[PDB]
Design an enzyme around this catalytic site. Structure first.
Site, mmCIF file in Angstrom:
data_model
loop_
_atom_site.group_PDB
_atom_site.id
_atom_site.type_symbol
_atom_site.label_atom_id
_atom_site.label_comp_id
_atom_site.label_asym_id
_atom_site.label_seq_id
_atom_site.Cartn_x
_atom_site.Cartn_y
_atom_site.Cartn_z
ATOM 1 N N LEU A 1 -21.429 -107.240 2.784
ATOM 2 C CA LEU A 1 -21.257 -106.131 3.710
ATOM 3 C C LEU A 1 -21.570 -104.813 3.003
ATOM 4 O O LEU A 1 -22.131 -104.786 1.904
ATOM 5 C CB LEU A 1 -19.853 -106.118 4.312
ATOM 6 C CG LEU A 1 -19.205 -107.403 4.822
ATOM 7 C CD1 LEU A 1 -18.215 -107.969 3.823
ATOM 8 C CD2 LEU A 1 -18.542 -107.132 6.156
ATOM 9 N N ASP A 2 -21.217 -103.702 3.639
ATOM 10 C CA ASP A 2 -21.456 -102.365 3.120
ATOM 11 C C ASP A 2 -20.129 -101.719 2.731
ATOM 12 O O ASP A 2 -19.049 -102.283 2.937
ATOM 13 C CB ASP A 2 -22.204 -101.520 4.155
ATOM 14 C CG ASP A 2 -23.035 -100.421 3.522
ATOM 15 O OD1 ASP A 2 -23.151 -100.409 2.279
ATOM 16 O OD2 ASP A 2 -23.562 -99.568 4.265
ATOM 17 N N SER A 3 -20.224 -100.525 2.142
ATOM 18 C CA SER A 3 -19.029 -99.760 1.799
ATOM 19 C C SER A 3 -18.270 -99.332 3.049
ATOM 20 O O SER A 3 -17.031 -99.314 3.059
ATOM 21 C CB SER A 3 -19.421 -98.541 0.967
ATOM 22 O OG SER A 3 -20.657 -98.008 1.414
ATOM 23 N N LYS B 1 -27.191 -92.874 7.330
ATOM 24 C CA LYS B 1 -26.990 -93.657 6.113
ATOM 25 C C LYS B 1 -28.270 -93.750 5.293
ATOM 26 O O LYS B 1 -28.239 -93.609 4.064
ATOM 27 C CB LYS B 1 -26.475 -95.053 6.466
ATOM 28 C CG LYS B 1 -26.430 -96.031 5.304
ATOM 29 C CD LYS B 1 -25.707 -97.310 5.696
ATOM 30 C CE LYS B 1 -26.579 -98.531 5.465
ATOM 31 N NZ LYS B 1 -25.767 -99.742 5.170
ATOM 32 N N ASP C 1 -18.034 -100.919 5.864
ATOM 33 C CA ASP C 1 -17.251 -102.064 6.312
ATOM 34 C C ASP C 1 -16.007 -102.266 5.454
ATOM 35 O O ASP C 1 -14.966 -102.686 5.968
ATOM 36 C CB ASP C 1 -18.124 -103.318 6.315
ATOM 37 C CG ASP C 1 -19.519 -103.050 6.855
ATOM 38 O OD1 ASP C 1 -19.658 -102.165 7.726
ATOM 39 O OD2 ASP C 1 -20.476 -103.715 6.409
#
Ligand SMILES: CCCCCCCCCCCCCCCCCC(=O)OC[C@H](COP(=O)([O-])OCC[N+](C)(C)C)OC(=O)CCCCCCCCCCCCCCCCC
Ligand SMILES: CCCCCCCCCCCCCCCCCC(=O)OC[C@H](COP(=O)([O-])OCC[N+](C)(C)C)OC(=O)CCCCCCCCCCCCCCCCC
Ligand SMILES: *C(=O)CCCCCCCCCCCCC
Lengths: 459, 99, 177, 122, 79, 50, 65, 128, 87, 330, 155, 171
Positions: free
Chosen positions: I41-43, C51, I45
């Protein structure tokens, strides 16, 4: 035959003297009376034909064709009474008069004892169909449809007439009740070869034979549907009557000469079935299916066995009825959607259930579902062609796959699937349309119970 | 990514209209307004009348035609007796037994 | 590449779609829940380890290797949801999605069988036909020159005015009719 | 079932062909050999409508089984003894069949020993 | 229309193979954030599923008892 | 349909049974063959020279 | 009555279906055991199979050579 | 390492494995933008002509009639007989006819020469 | 078979799936709680949540609509529109 | 063409797209046996002929081996039982190809019963899981649907040929006639491998559909208390328990029974069934490990229907349509 | 519809090529025609020859059953390239490898079937014995001809 | 009824039904139920229709054609008597076709009624069918769909010359 010709020529003033709103009702009623009256022609014997007079006779062969013709006229009158509502009354009477004259010339064609009389009215039939095709069509190409339809057929028969006249100078009479006993064998020579070609090519064009079939799709995708039904159902049968009246005189040179005609018919019926597999118009698809059926009839009469003659007559009548009702289906679709594209209007079973049922019955009777008369004729021709040679069944077998493959596919993309969203003028079933469809369909099922009336002259 | 206020407001109004229409799809209690107009009836009509009809047809119209109902003759074993004649098939010879 | 609104798929969207398709194929590979959870955590940890990579060209080449192994190691028959395209019941109930304008063709002797519904239908049709000129007025001034540049429909900018081109998107029947 | 490997992978001369056997004379080493017996006379064997595949040499148990089946209706399970007798007769016929196979194999192997002795001294 | 949903604290991942899965990620330093989602399938009546041989011999006790009763009945019947 | 169902003996087909039902009844009672290979009388034909 | 659906729990089981299923399994195993005790032939054998190697020569009528 | 999935007539390359997606030249997005503009114009026209309460009829797509006219009526007027077209027509027009003619011919002579000499078994063949 | 679901039923379901996620604390969640803004959160998630909802409701959400709905209320609206609630 | 054998097989698995009772009647029990019924109808002609018997025996063995191989690793339950019934059709043409008519007819009568009952049990399971037909999402239904659990276990046991069931009275006679006759050894070998594969896929259905931990979504709508389904499954369960015995008792003896054979040619069916059960039990136990095995060419050749609807359903229509348009219509 | 709405002859220069490209409403560079080999194709656009299963199924198509929009210049073989016909889906396995595997499998077990035909299996038994000269009369033979009396001998 | 020579059937031999076990069979009870409920009203309505038949009993006659001079005594190209000869020839053609049909009916009835051993007891029917098939093949085969008495006479002439040539070349 004066008890049916005089009713037609006396119904002619009836459609000329009718009122401004009762032309259709009076013509349909009186044509149905003539249709009931026409059943008296079935007084047939196992040895002698019903010879009415000097210039009129009707054996077991031509009687089902006559019954089909004057049962076909009221169906044409119902199928052509919608779009002619805005047409002028004088031209409406002209159209009905043209249909009546076409029926009269057709009934005079099938019962002509002399072959010269048969030829003379067999292309006196050419004028009304040409007039209807060129005048009451709906596209520009109808003008071209008046050329390719005409200059083919006459070009096949202007030799033929000369040949017929030559027989008048050779035998001394062209009567068919005489020529069954005065017939001489045909020797092997170039002169007899060209006489066979001249006597064959006119009805080879009128079937049509493959290679000479170009006039059939170009004259069907634009016609008024009365013209389409008379062309597909009864006008193509003049070739069959020409075969079963002419092939008596052309023995035994036909046996060792008709090889390229049979090759052309078989491989062209394969080609036209394949062309049906990749079509975009309903009318062209039905026309090419008719080309395949008439090529099969060509092979059936060219091999000249009794089983083949039974199958040829049964297939002729069944294909005429099936093609007429298929053209009725296509006319209903073109009425509702104002186009001839197959992929345009899809999924009509979701909107029109009874037309879907008629589509299913048409497709089932097209691919020769037993015990229909289509399967009877097709099976008899299959066995006769297997008797001619073995390998022919291979050349049949692929076709019997392909003649199913489009026959459902032409149904499926027109009836099954998600319906087109941007089409919303799909009206429900008019009673006139479904009455016409049932009048087409019910005799086709009924003739399966008693096939012996349509099994040719040698049953 | 997320929702622009224009498209979010558009789908909000479209969902409001959809919820409205699906609320109005329900029917009132009075619809539909229909217009106004034995235990052993199946075993008699659907069975007995076909038996009588097909037995009349088979007895007095098919048996009168020859070679229509062609039946295999019953097998004949030793020790039997034909009713229509009375002659007895004679007994089969004794088995040369082994068991 | 082919979208109703966009003309180019951003590399982030391609990475997310690769993650979705690869994890769906992984779930279709190992049936049981525990193995699927373990290998899904492994794949998420791998995508997390890759990432933190802000180089566009390096993520480009890593995406190319990733797509190549994903096509190399995919199940021949991935699991497809029963309503998804390619499923066992894809467009099966579509034979009963009769449009509303067929109610135009009903006989008047049956249009009195459901009077309230038909009255509601005619007043809805009246609402639509008076809103049609308002919504075409809305598009005729908001659309840029030479036609629209994107297919995204504008909302309704005024209170009381109906959404523009609202009818045939809101008119589709229920999926279980 | 080692005869297949002895014939194909081994030597096919030892195992005779079942299509045309026995080709040896039947009186070879069997003086006063008595043939098999048929119990049912041909008319009484034919009027029972028995199929040609089952027209064996001891079909008396078979026709008695057919009679037992035809007169014990509806108690279908009352004729297992006659079925056992017919099974015994068919089994005995099968013993006769592999006895014929073993006789043919041993006689032809004796012919092999004979031609080996011709190779030894003649 | 309205259904009651169970307590979301009674779904624990302990006593299940998902606990061993979380042990494996703890051994390799990872987390299992979706164990509680699949936790409900591994407890209650939905758990404790018989094996293949246990599936084949279902109801063997009643069948064998009836078989021995019937064979005793026939043993007395032949006498 | 009623007319063609009760049509009077199309092509004398049923008659073709009845006379045939007579004819074999003749020639099975006098030892004659069923049908002969000669359609006409073989004694009433002048054979051409060979 | 009709069984109300349960959210992520064990579904309700009527006693009728369990009783009928256990009944059918019991009759299945009882029929298998009864047929295996009574017949005991088609699963294990009907008649003994004599070996081809135990036959003598006087049964086959082979003179010695 | 990994199997290279070859392009085929019956197996096209996927939309994802194609390198043409992943080039970052400017004319790619310019072409995509102009394609989106054309599609937006066509979709806007269809939605305006398709959601109309007044219209009761088929939305006449010019593309459908254009394709059906190009399928049949526009074959001969833009046809020029050259070596390729004439060669293909002669190959697919008279080839199978000659092949079937010769096969059926030699079958006919074989059957006839078998039946005149009595070798063909026609014991029960009385229906023909 | 397949009883219709109200909006509060799918709302209970979506909050249940959110509460069963380890990254979501079971106290700060709401219908309009943004994943990147309210909770951060993130993408990845977000796609995890989308897969959880796809497996829970037993149907496939397209990837564009998977990435477009960005709040639990948007999820409720999309599910209620696709199942056509309040019939 | 009618029994969907080699060359013309894939329409039988393709025809599972219709409704479940349509499949369960036509393409499971009744319509598919019409070709085999025509073959056993014409037994006096096939009795004295060897060429047709040999080629139809080889075609039947080819069909049953290929369809069993495709049925081994498939993921759709209805496709699995469709390949099962095509393998059974191949086995019935195998046993009519060895001159045993009434055994094949008895197998038809038994196969209609048990195959139809498996199809309706699978359909009940499909409806109870809201129209989801993948074997990779069912399971854990032993106590969920005990009636269909018992019926499916009995049906799989009868399909395998377990002793003293309805499949025992026909398939065991078929395989004992196939062992002790003048047959092709390759056909017999593929018959035994087909029997093992039937055992493997039946216990695969049992393991992945009736045991283990659940995989379906959480909305549990499990219900089977409607009297129609219970009565129908009970009727066909009574049939598949006793009607085979009744039919095998009451048929008249029309063929010579063969019962003199060695023990290793008589225990063959049960031993091969148990061996297939053991091998698939090994596969099922090894699938539970938290590992990853990269699939070889075997899995690609098996799960993709032998590539027959991928090669012969892509090239032949392309060739036919290009011949029709580019060469004929244009 | 008029004389410049229906498709015309082959466009040669860039200007008439652009006129034809805006006739079909597509890109000027992406509009490229079939080579004028004399088959009578015309100015119809040449699609990249892919099937219609490859289209986006989730996109709001104008025609959903065909995945076709409005005004798009469609394929020369749209009828051939429907979902109900020849499909060009990207298979997970190589096409040439698929053909090689199928041909090798079919040829291998056909060869094995013929090999088993050459070397068959059987039982260690003798021929079946039938009475009355192997059932001469029951085979359908004539009774006026006396057969050769062949007897079957016990062992 | 029908004549028993043209459709011959052997007399029926039905064995005595004698029970071996003590369990009764339902066939006798159902036969009694059939005789009571079904056969009696059928016989009653049959006696009704035949009693109504007995009041009006008129006759119909089988048409017979006298023998006419055949095609051999016809002057060529004189239609007025070869028409009658062809008429008689077509009638005899139909009669011969029905004769082969009735022989086929006899063969089928024999093969069905003789059970599983029909290959031996229907030898006479097979010989009669083979003779009549050879007769029909010599008399009418290969005439073509346009058959006439002249073509049949020419075929008979060619067969006679072939037979005479075979006699002369093997004398
Ligand atoms: C569809 C278009 C094509 C149509 C093709 C039609 C068939 C082809 C042949 C037709 C020939 C013309 C009719 C001939 C009839 C002869 C009857 C007869 O008994 O002949 C024996 C007579 C024999 O001569 P005779 O009988 O006078 O001699 C006495 C007898 N002997 C020989 C013993 C001394 O044949 C002829 O006289 C010549 C016949 C051949 C004619 C050749 C010229 C015409 C060629 C074909 C043209 C076709 C139309 C082309 C244009 C179409 C429109 C664009
Ligand atoms: C004719 C050529 C031109 C074609 C177009 C003609 C247009 C004019 C049409 C005029 C009207 C129609 C005339 C033809 C009528 C033909 C029918 C007819 O009358 O036949 C006479 C025939 C006559 O029968 P017959 O010939 O056996 O009788 C012999 C004659 N007598 C009685 C004097 C001894 O009628 C029948 O066969 C009717 C049989 C009984 C009725 C049907 C019962 C069964 C029905 C179906 C049950 C379900 C079966 C399973 C279904 C499964 C699913 C598919
Ligand atoms: C000698 O062993 C011959 C047996 C019959 C022919 C071979 C049959 C092989 C397959 C069946 C038996 C398998 C035993 C493991």
């Amino acid at each position: 035959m004066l008890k049916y010709i005089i009713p037609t020529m006396m119904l002619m003033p009836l459609t000329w003297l009718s009122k401004n709103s009762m032309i259709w009702i009076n013509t349909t009623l009186h044509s149905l009376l003539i249709s009931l009256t026409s059943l008296l022609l079935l007084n047939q014997f196992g040895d002698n034909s019903l010879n009415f007079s000097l210039t009129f006779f009707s054996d077991s062969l031509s009687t089902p064709l006559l019954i089909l013709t004057m049962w076909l006229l009221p169906l044409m009158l119902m199928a052509s009474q919608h779009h002619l509502s805005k047409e002028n009354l004088a031209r409406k009477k002209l159209f009905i008069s043209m249909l009546i004259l076409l029926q009269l010339f057709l009934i005079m064609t099938f019962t002509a004892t002399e072959l010269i009389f048969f030829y003379i009215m067999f292309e006196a039939t050419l004028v009304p169909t040409l007039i209807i095709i060129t005048r009451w069509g709906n596209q520009t190409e109808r003008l071209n449809a008046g050329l390719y339809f005409l200059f083919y057929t006459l070009a096949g028969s202007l030799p033929l007439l000369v040949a017929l006249i030559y027989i008048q100078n050779t035998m001394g009479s062209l009567n068919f009740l005489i020529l069954q006993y005065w017939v001489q064998p045909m020797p092997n020579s170039w002169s007899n070869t060209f006489m066979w070609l001249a006597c064959m090519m006119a009805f080879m064009v009128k079937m049509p034979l493959y290679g000479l079939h170009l006039w059939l799709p170009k004259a069907h995708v634009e016609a008024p549907i009365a013209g389409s039904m008379v062309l597909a159902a009864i006008l193509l049968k003049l070739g069959g009557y020409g075969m079963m009246r002419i092939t008596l005189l052309l023995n035994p040179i036909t046996d060792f000469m008709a090889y390229p005609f049979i090759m052309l018919s078989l491989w062209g019926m394969i080609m036209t079935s394949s062309i049906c597999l990749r079509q975009t118009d309903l009318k062209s698809l039905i026309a090419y299916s008719s080309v395949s059926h008439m090529a099969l009839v060509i092979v059936a009469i060219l091999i000249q066995t009794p089983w083949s003659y039974m199958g040829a007559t049964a297939l002729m009548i069944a294909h005429g009825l099936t093609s007429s009702m298929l053209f009725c289906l296509a006319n209903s679709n073109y009425e509702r959607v104002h186009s001839r594209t197959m992929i345009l209007a899809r999924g009509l079973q979701t909107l029109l259930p009874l037309m879907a049922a008629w589509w299913l019955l048409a497709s089932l009777t097209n691919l020769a579902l037993p015990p229909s008369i289509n399967l009877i004729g097709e099976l008899f021709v299959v066995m006769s062609t297997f008797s001619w040679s073995n390998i022919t069944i291979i050349l049949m077998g692929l076709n019997m796959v392909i003649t199913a493959l489009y026959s459902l596919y032409m149904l499926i993309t027109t009836q099954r699937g998600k319906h087109t969203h941007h089409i919303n003028n799909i009206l429900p079933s008019f009673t006139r349309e479904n009455a016409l469809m049932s009048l087409h369909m019910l005799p086709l099922l009924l003739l399966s119970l008693n096939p012996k009336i349509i099994l040719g002259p040698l049953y | 990514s997320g929702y622009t206020p224009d498209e979010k407001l558009r789908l909000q109004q479209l969902r409001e209209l959809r919820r409205r229409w699906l609320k109005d799809q329900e029917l009132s209690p009075r619809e539909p307004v229909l217009p106004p107009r034995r235990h052993s009836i199946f075993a008699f009509t659907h069975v007995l009348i076909p038996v009588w009809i097909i037995h009349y047809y088979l007895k007095y119209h098919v048996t009168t035609k020859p070679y229509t109902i062609v039946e295999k003759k019953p097998r004949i074993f030793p020790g039997d007796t034909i009713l229509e004649t009375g002659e007895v098939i004679p007994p089969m010879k004794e088995f040369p037994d082994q068991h | 590449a082919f979208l109703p609104s966009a003309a180019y798929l951003t590399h982030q969207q391609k990475v997310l779609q690769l993650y979705k398709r690869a994890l769906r194929h992984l779930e279709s590979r190992c049936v049981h829940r525990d193995k699927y959870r373990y290998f899904a955590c492994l794949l998420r940890a791998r995508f997390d380890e890759h990432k933190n990579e802000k180089d566009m060209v390096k993520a480009t080449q890593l995406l190319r290797e990733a797509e190549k192994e994903f096509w190399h190691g995919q199940h021949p028959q991935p699991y497809i949801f029963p309503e998804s395209p390619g499923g066992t019941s894809y467009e099966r109930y579509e034979c009963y999605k009769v449009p509303e304008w067929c109610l135009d063709d009903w006989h008047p002797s049956e249009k009195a069988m459901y009077p309230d519904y038909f009255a509601k239908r005619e007043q809805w049709k009246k609402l639509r036909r008076e809103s049609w000129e308002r919504e075409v007025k809305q598009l005729q001034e908001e659309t840029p020159v030479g036609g629209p540049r994107t297919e995204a429909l504008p909302p309704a900018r005024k209170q009381g005015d109906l959404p523009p081109l609202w009818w045939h998107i809101v008119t589709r029947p229920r999926e279980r009719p | 079932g080692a005869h297949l490997a002895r014939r194909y992978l081994g030597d096919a001369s030892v195992e005779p062909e079942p299509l045309r056997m026995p080709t040896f004379p039947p009186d070879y080493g069997f003086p006063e050999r008595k043939e098999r017996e048929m119990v049912a006379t041909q008319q009484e064997m034919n009027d029972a409508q028995l199929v040609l595949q089952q027209r064996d040499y001891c079909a008396h148990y078979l026709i008695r089984f057919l009679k037992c089946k035809r007169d014990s209706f509806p108690n279908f399970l009352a004729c297992k003894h006659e079925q056992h007798d017919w099974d015994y007769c068919e089994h005995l016929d099968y013993v006769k069949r592999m006895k014929e196979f073993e006789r043919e194999r041993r006689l032809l192997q004796r012919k092999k020993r004979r031609e080996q002795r011709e190779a030894d001294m003649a | 229309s309205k259904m009651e949903l169970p307590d979301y604290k009674q779904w624990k991942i302990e006593g299940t193979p998902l606990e061993t899965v979380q042990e494996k990620l703890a051994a390799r330093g990872l987390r299992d954030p979706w164990g509680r989602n699949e936790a409900w399938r591994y407890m209650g009546g939905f758990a404790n599923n018989v094996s293949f041989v246990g599936a084949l011999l279902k109801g063997f006790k009643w069948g064998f008892a009836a078989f021995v009763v019937a064979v005793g009945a026939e043993y007395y019947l032949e006498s | 349909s009623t007319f063609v169902a009760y049509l009077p003996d199309y092509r004398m087909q049923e008659w073709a049974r009845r006379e045939a039902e007579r004819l074999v009844k003749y020639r099975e009672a006098h030892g004659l063959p069923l049908m002969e290979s000669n359609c006409f009388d073989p004694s009433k034909i002048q054979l051409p020279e060979d | 009555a009709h069984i109300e659906p349960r959210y992520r729990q064990f579904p309700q089981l009527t006693r009728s279906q369990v009783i009928q299923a256990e009944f059918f399994s019991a009759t299945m195993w009882f029929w298998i055991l009864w047929r295996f005790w009574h017949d005991s032939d088609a699963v294990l054998g009907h008649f003994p199979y004599p070996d081809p190697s135990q036959w003598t020569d006087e049964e086959l009528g082979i003179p010695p050579d | 390492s990994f199997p290279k999935y070859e392009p085929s007539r019956l197996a096209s390359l996927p939309t994802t494995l194609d390198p043409a997606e992943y080039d970052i030249s400017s004319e790619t997005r310019k072409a995509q933008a102009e394609r989106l503009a054309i599609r937006s114009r066509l979709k806007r026209e269809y939605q305006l002509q398709y959601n109309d309460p007044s219209r009761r009829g088929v939305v006449e797509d010019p593309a459908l009639i254009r394709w059906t006219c190009a399928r049949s009526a526009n074959v001969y007027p833009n046809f020029r007989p050259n070596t390729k077209t004439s060669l293909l027509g002669a190959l697919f027009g008279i080839g199978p006819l000659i092949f079937w003619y010769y096969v059926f011919k030699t079958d006919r002579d074989r059957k006839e020469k078998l039946i005149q000499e009595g070798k063909l078994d026609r014991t029960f063949n009385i229906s023909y | 078979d397949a009883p219709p679901l109200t909006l509060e039923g799918i709302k209970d379901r979506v909050l249940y799936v959110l509460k069963l996620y380890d990254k979501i604390d079971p106290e700060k969640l709401s219908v309009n709680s943004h994943f990147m803004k309210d909770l951060g959160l993130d993408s990845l998630d977000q796609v995890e949540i989308i897969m959880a909802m796809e497996d829970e409701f037993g149907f496939e959400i397209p990837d564009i609509d998977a990435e477009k709905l960005m709040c639990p209320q948007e999820i409720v609206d999309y599910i209620a529109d696709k199942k056509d609630v309040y019939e | 063409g009618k029994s969907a054998q080699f060359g013309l097989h894939p329409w039988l698995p393709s025809a599972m797209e219709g409704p479940t009772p349509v499949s369960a009647l036509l393409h499971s029990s009744t319509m598919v046996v019409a070709g085999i019924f025509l073959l056993i109808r014409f037994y006096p002609l096939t009795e004295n002929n060897k060429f047709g018997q040999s080629i139809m025996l080889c075609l039947g063995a080819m069909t049953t081996l290929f369809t069993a191989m495709c049925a081994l690793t498939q993921n759709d339950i209805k496709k699995i039982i469709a390949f099962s019934t095509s393998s059974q059709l191949g086995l019935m043409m195998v046993t009519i190809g060895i001159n045993q008519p009434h055994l094949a007819f008895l197998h038809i009568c038994t196969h209609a019963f048990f195959k139809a009952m498996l199809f309706m049990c699978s359909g009940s399971i499909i409806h109870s899981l809201n129209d989801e037909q993948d074997i990779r999402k069912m399971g854990g239904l032993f106590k969920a649907m005990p009636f269909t659990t018992t019926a499916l276990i009995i049906g799989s046991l009868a399909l395998t040929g377990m002793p003293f069931l309805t499949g025992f009275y026909s398939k065991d006679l078929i395989i004992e006639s196939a062992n002790t006759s003048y047959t092709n050894a390759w056909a017999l070998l593929m018959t035994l491998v087909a029997t093992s594969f039937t055992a493997i896929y039946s216990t695969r259905i049992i393991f992945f559909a009736l045991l283990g931990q659940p995989r379906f979504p959480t909305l549990i709508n499990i219900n089977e208390n409607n009297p129609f389904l219970i009565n129908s499954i009970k009727r066909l369960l009574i049939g598949s328990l006793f009607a085979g015995f009744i039919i095998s008792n009451n048929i008249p003896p029309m063929t010579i029974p063969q019962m003199t054979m060695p023990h290793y040619l008589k225990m063959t069916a049960l031993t091969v069934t148990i061996l297939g059960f053991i091998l698939a039990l090994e596969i099922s136990n090894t699938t539970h490990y938290l590992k990853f095995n990269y699939p070889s060419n075997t899995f690609k050749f098996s799960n993709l229907l032998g590539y027959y609807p991928t090669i012969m359903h892509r090239l032949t229509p392309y060739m036919n349509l290009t011949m029709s348009q580019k060469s004929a219509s244009s | 519809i008029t004389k410049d709405m229906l498709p015309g002859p082959y466009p040669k220069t860039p200007e008439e090529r652009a006129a034809a490209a805006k006739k079909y409403n597509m890109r000027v560079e992406d509009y490229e025609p079939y080579p004028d080999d004399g088959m009578g194709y015309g100015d119809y656009p040449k699609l990249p020859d892919r099937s219609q299963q490859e289209r986006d199924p989730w996109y709001d198509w104008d025609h959903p059953d065909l995945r076709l929009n409005w005004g798009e210049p469609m394929h020369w073989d749209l009828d051939m390239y429907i979902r109900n016909r020849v499909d060009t889906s990207p298979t997970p396995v190589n096409w040439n490898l698929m053909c090689k595997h199928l041909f090798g499998f079919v040829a291998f077990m056909l060869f094995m079937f013929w090999v088993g035909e050459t070397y068959p299996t059987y039982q260690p038994v003798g021929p079946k014995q039938y009475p009355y000269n192997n059932l001469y009369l029951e085979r359908g033979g004539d009774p006026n001809k006396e057969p050769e009396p062949v007897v079957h001998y016990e062992i | 009824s029908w004549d028993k020579d043209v459709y011959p059937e052997p007399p029926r031999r039905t064995p005595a039904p004698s029970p071996q076990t003590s369990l009764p069979n339902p066939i006798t009870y159902l036969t009694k139920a059939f005789d009571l409920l079904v056969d009696r009203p059928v016989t009653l309505v049959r006696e009704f229709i035949e009693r109504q038949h007995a009041k009006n009993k008129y006759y119909y006659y089988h048409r017979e054609f006298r023998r006419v001079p055949d095609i051999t005594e016809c002057h060529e190209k004189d239609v007025l008597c070869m028409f009658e000869a062809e008429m008689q020839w077509k009638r005899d053609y139909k009669v011969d076709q029905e004769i082969v049909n009735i022989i086929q009916e006899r063969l089928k009835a024999c093969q069905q009624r003789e059970g599983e051993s029909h290959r031996q007891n229907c030898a006479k029917e097979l010989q009669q069918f083979t003779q009549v098939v050879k007769a029909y093949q010599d008399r009418y085969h290969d005439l073509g769909a346009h058959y006439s008495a002249r073509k049949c006479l020419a075929k008979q002439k060619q067969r006679m010359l072939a037979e005479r040539k075979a006699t002369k070349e093997a004398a």
